[PDB]
């Protein structure tokens, strides 16, 4: 039921968001077996070394931990404009 709403709408939204100015990195290649993120530092001879991607564990931002359970409401508790009188701009 929900598949049309994903593949034929939300797909487009990822496709446009992927072109937004600040979404500036290659997050995934589609290959789980091989893809690793490109890694960078601001480094100096004078002894500084600043990784762009560090592992620090849960932050104040609330952005780091990922509950996978989010997948459940999406499949079984969400309307979509495409799925649901069924006309909707």
């Amino acid at each position: 039921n929900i598949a049309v709403a994903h593949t034929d709408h939300l797909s487009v939204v990822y496709a446009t968001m992927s072109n937004f100015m600040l979404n500036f990195t290659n997050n995934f290649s589609g290959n789980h077996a091989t893809f690793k993120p490109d890694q960078y530092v601001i480094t100096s001879p004078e002894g500084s070394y600043k990784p762009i991607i560090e592992r620090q564990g849960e932050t104040v931002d609330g952005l780091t931990i990922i509950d996978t359970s989010i997948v459940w409401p999406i499949l079984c508790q969400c309307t979509y404009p495409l799925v649901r009188s069924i006309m909707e701009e």
């Binding site: 890694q39 480094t43 001879p45 004078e46 002894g47 070394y49 990784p51 560090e54």
Partner: protein
């Protein structure tokens, strides 16, 4: 960068190894002169040491500058160190193992990820040699790779207590080491060794080759033996003192026999289980280099 001399880095006065003794800075050899041995009924017979594993543990992405020297010296002779396998930063030595890496082992004993100003460091080739073996200290803990912690100590005995004849024979009586001694002597010795810049000794042991290497092995034999002495005190079953006409002689029994003991005691620095596997791995590697 420090250029390595025709001899080892140990030829430099900057890296002299000298335990404190009788109000002066004694060279380790003239402390080893003080040692004497009460032979017992048991025999130490050295088996061939197993070849160290080909595998070099991954130096996982650590942003910072690991203080490798301090870690090795405290896992080896530390008065309070424990769970030396828990952090596992010894693997970091492996970062130096690559050809043309940007990492440098500083004289401070730090592993910088990048060459940096006003911090002198060892020649990267020689350090790549040293890392090419001692990075394997990183798998002192992993079940597939632990060293024997019982057999290797027979070698320790031979290289410490052994006479030239017993050494060439490969079999010596188990001995009870002893020396006229001051209060707190083993702790003072071990702390005077924890201060040693052992990476100099290790890098020269790995990098030098040919006759120039051989002269190292004689010139620095006594240093090796001093480290060996601190380890052997760490595993000795007991360290009694003897009164003798208003002079006290410290006596550790026995050289060359790991007792596996892990309970602390005032007399000498103590190994947790982790330090047993660490020192045993360190010995496997260091002797494997030492005999060639």
């Amino acid at each position: 960068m420090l250029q390595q001399p025709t001899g080892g880095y140990t030829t430099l006065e900057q890296f002299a190894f000298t335990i404190r003794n009788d109000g002066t800075n004694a060279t380790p050899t003239q402390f080893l002169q003080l040692l004497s041995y009460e032979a017992t009924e048991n025999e130490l017979v050295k088996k061939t040491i197993p070849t160290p594993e080909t595998h070099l543990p991954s130096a996982r992405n650590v942003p910072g500058n690991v203080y490798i020297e301090d870690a090795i010296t405290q896992a080896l002779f530390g008065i309070s160190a424990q769970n030396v396998n828990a952090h596992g930063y010894f693997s970091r030595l492996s970062a130096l193992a690559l050809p043309n890496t940007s990492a440098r082992l500083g004289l401070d004993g730090v592993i910088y990820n990048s060459e940096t100003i006003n911090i002198p460091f060892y020649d990267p080739a020689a350090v790549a040699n040293f890392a090419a073996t001692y990075a394997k200290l990183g798998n002192a803990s992993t079940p597939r790779y632990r060293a024997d912690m019982i057999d290797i100590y027979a070698h320790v005995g031979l290289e410490l207590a052994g006479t030239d004849a017993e050494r060439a024979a490969g079999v010596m009586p188990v001995k009870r080491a002893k020396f006229d001694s001051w209060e707190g002597s083993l702790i003072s010795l071990s702390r005077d060794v924890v201060n040693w810049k052992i990476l100099a000794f290790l890098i020269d042991l790995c990098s030098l080759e040919g006759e120039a290497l051989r002269a190292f092995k004689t010139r620095n034999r006594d240093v090796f033996r001093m480290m060996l002495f601190i380890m052997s005190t760490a595993v000795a079953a007991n360290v009694v003192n003897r009164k003798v006409t208003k002079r006290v002689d410290r006596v550790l029994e026995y050289i060359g026999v790991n007792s596996m003991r892990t309970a602390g005691r005032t007399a000498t620095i103590t190994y947790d289980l982790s330090r047993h596997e660490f020192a045993a791995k360190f010995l496997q590697l260091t002797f494997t280099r030492w005999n060639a």
